[PDB]
């Protein structure tokens, strides 16, 4: 999964996925 693949994901996904790394 690339950062661009991530950049295409819905807003909730941006939060949820970055939540794993601890951005949210």
């Amino acid at each position: 999964m690339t950062r661009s693949a991530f950049a295409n994901l819905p807003l909730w996904k941006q939060q949820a996925l970055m939540k794993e790394k601890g951005l949210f």
Side-chain angles (χ1 to χ4, degrees), residues 2-19:
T2 57
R3 48 181 289 148
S4 301
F6 168 91
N8 283 268
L9 307 183
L11 185 61
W12 67 266
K13 270 209 166 181
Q14 306 293 264
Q15 305 178 30
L17 292 178
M18 298 284 74
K19 185 277 287 72

